[PDB]
Symmetry: D2
Subunit: 302 residues, 4 copies
């Protein structure tokens, strides 16, 4: 009923930093996580590679090298082996390539792994940000819509050891719908990671609100659904692109209870009461008492 939640923030991953190098970095973050007494740690979106959707690819073989064809492969396996050894669970983001009768399916994926090292849940990015094709004016591209298709798992909630946990990935956190769907399935924790450049070329006049919009999204989603949340970022200057920091853990009230201060690998932790959620969900946001879904229909029209 009580647990210790952590965020394993990563600094940049170089274009040619090997998965084995990154697993080692992830491995140390468990280390620091036992030291602050942690039960579950959340790692970033696409946490095994540089953020490749910044580049416009012409060579398919090159592109595929940034995806996982299994999870875990021999390279990533030490990450799991160690989880089952120390008994800490985690949320890991990666690029998932599946081949279905010769057809390649491309997903921005995150999984939930338990004290025992078992994959107990998967999510696939539903809200894919960025643009459809190459744009010369931009210092970097954001080509997620080309390199991934929108996820086909919906927004599920899973038991992970003691807790009901939902997953979001990156831009997902900006949609109230992401949170509401998992709120409606009783998520106690909603977690995921992100890569959020501090510069947006189409709308550079919002650059100085990057931290603001990021924090506003977490605080509001948490509050509105009485859920704990954690956001693990890949942060700092990666391949000449500055990524937003401010990885955080948020209480069901919307209060930020942990915040990272560096642009490097950083473990933050927070003490988690799974019944705290009831301060909102059995009261001001008592759904059975207060929501009027009959009057929300337009939201689900398509």
């Amino acid at each position: 009923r009580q647990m210790i939640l952590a965020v394993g923030q990563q600094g940049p991953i170089a274009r040619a930093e090997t998965r084995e190098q990154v697993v080692g970095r992830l491995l140390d973050m468990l280390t620091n996580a036992a030291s602050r007494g942690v039960n579950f740690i959340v790692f970033p979106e696409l946490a095994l590679t540089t953020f490749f959707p910044r580049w416009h690819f012409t060579d398919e073989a090159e592109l595929d090298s940034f995806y996982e064809t299994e999870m875990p492969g021999p390279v990533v396996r030490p990450l799991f082996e160690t989880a089952a050894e120390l008994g800490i669970g985690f949320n890991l983001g990666y690029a998932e390539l599946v081949v279905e009768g010769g057809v390649k399916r491309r997903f921005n994926t995150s999984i939930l792994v338990d004290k025992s090292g078992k994959i107990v849940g998967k999510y696939r990015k539903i809200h894919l940000p960025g643009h459809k094709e190459y744009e010369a004016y931009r210092p970097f591209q954001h080509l997620e819509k080309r390199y991934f298709e929108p996820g086909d798992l919906g927004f599920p909630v899973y038991d992970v050891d003691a807790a009901k946990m939902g997953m979001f990935i990156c831009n997902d956190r900006r949609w109230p719908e992401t949170w509401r769907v998992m709120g409606l399935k009783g998520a106690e924790i909603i977690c995921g990671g992100y890569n959020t450049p501090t510069h947006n070329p189409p709308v550079p006049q919002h650059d100085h609100l990057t931290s603001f919009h990021h924090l506003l999204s977490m605080q509001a989603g948490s509050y509105q659904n009485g859920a704990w949340s954690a956001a693990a970022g890949k942060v700092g200057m990666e391949e000449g692109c500055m990524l937003l920091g401010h990885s955080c853990i948020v209480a069901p009230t919307g209060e930020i209870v942990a915040l990272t201060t560096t642009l490097e690998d950083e473990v933050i932790t927070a003490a988690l009461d799974l019944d705290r959620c009831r301060e909102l969900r059995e009261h001001i946001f008592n759904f059975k008492a207060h929501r009027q879904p009959q009057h929300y229909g337009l939201i689900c029209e398509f």
Copy 2:
């Protein structure tokens, strides 16, 4: 495409203060607004009377006196007339009593009046907070559920002069769904009033978060829909109950561009560019490019 939006915050209204006295105060805020170039002013929720839902009534005629059987009545007609010659539209909130089909219908209602002085549209509070029956364990009562039934008009968006405008009322603002429904309808300004006590009897351990939660709600609602918003409180120490100030105006980005500092009658204004919504609605929150209504189904189930 550009206008000056205002909020006319009310200091407390005593149980003995007459509707005439209250309309005089409103008249004063109107003329103050004019001096500051204002085209439209948002007034508070149940702006004509003290906040009666805080008391348990056993005499019905005494409960009824707090309602309007017409809008405008002869006492309120001065507000409409003055507003008309000044070319200032307004959002006014009040208790509405209508009798249809052998049923006394009671609503928490707001109207939009355009600058020509035409009542252009109506909203009726859909999310009623508090409780239905008197509760012993409470300092003061909160009986909106007893004295009002849910609104029967959905969340409409109306053309008001040049702008698409939706209303919310008090607790509605706390629900992302309220915002999203009007966002999907293209609302450019979303506005309404509130009475929000600084003490909450079922959860007094959130009392120090009253301002936090109020502004988090407006800011996140505005950002996620690219909407301007304005929120007019009735504030101060009213009949022993302290009401939250911080009446505000909010940009489509979630930035607060005007905020009250007194707990009395006070008019704040901001410059308003309807095209700024585009910044979000043609980009990060392009609903057609990005939204995924087919995974949002659980939200509209009832």
Copy 3:
């Protein structure tokens, strides 16, 4: 004791844009302000030209071009003339060039003009940020220490009409001592402007905190002295360098009561009540009752 205060934020000024053009922009904002009942308006730091300290000048004559040798000169006169006839005071910042006793002195200067139109007071920037020598390993330069000397007027407070007003310029606002010197002289309003790059080459890991540190400083300064403050930015992308927006007005409590949202020429307004200062100065921050200067000595050692 009551007035309407404005901030006149400027979008960027190119290297080749002329004093008469910039004065044109300033008059427009001045015009917009009068329509909104404004009594006093704050303009930015070095409001008359581009931010020259960003470049290394070898030609002493071209450096001197950016300075004023009189105030107002012929080009700036129309600003004075108009504001005087409207009865609207202003704060204007500029680069000042004065020769006294064989010495060519260069100051980062601001003045207060009252509503009849006399220059009532001058202030010269005391805290010069940046560096003295060209520094290759930074993308843009910040040569204020080279191009100005620290000001020789202290931190004055002047009677401007009904109000006790003090000035700061840019980096001054970050030093609690700026605020406190004027606090101790009874300032009711402390105003000034700034050019604040959103990138900082020595410490780029604070880049995403630029708005935060800017607002923190205003809000803390205002609250601790019980003063209204007003901060006029010159903002947006200027000569390849992006400058912070977020111009604002702040109440004696430290509450932001008006905030800009564009990165362009933009007027914002706020009703100021000079007696609201008492809430802090006759109570929690009553200096006579509470302050212990016997223990502050280390602050004044030089």
Copy 4:
């Protein structure tokens, strides 16, 4: 250069709760802190008793009972022993009674105790809030100026194991001068406790800014001096009075990195790099390079 910092917030202490009971509450916390891997833990102002300055005293013997005549007494001694044996430093607040030739000295006091159980420093509260004489309209008194005298040690900074640490107490945090004096003695950590009612009887219009004000004070102080800060509250409903929560740990940038969410005994932690201070203190606030104490003279006059 690294260490873990904890805040051990307290929930209410009742008027008749004993010191043995309280020490046991603090012992629990000192214990957890080790389990979480903490090096130094901050406890509240007057952490050994209910907040007695809320009452008007008419009996000296009864008043004296809330004070320590020695540090530690036999009762408090276990706290010293357990912390020393666990190798955890702490900051503890209490009421100090000293006798000098029959003259009684009263102080609102806090001490620093290092890992080895040695008392390495003392601070006595310099800025005493509230009023001096009984005021009947108030639901609780604040009679600190009657029950203590202003502290006589100044704002010292001490070597605590690895760190230079300054102490403030409660209201002290609101004064830029507190922070600046210790900033100038090179504090890397500035910590203390508070009892901060959320209702202030003479200025109730700021009640809903209580968190805002407390946090604003913390963040600005830290940023301005490039110091880590920790603030441990005694919180919750204590003898009828609601005391502010939001105990926190703050980085030298003024970013909150840990925050309490309950109103009961709660332990929070933060990873502190004593060298992060350099980010401020060698750049924007490089005192030697930038400060102008020559011009600050009015600050130190008495």
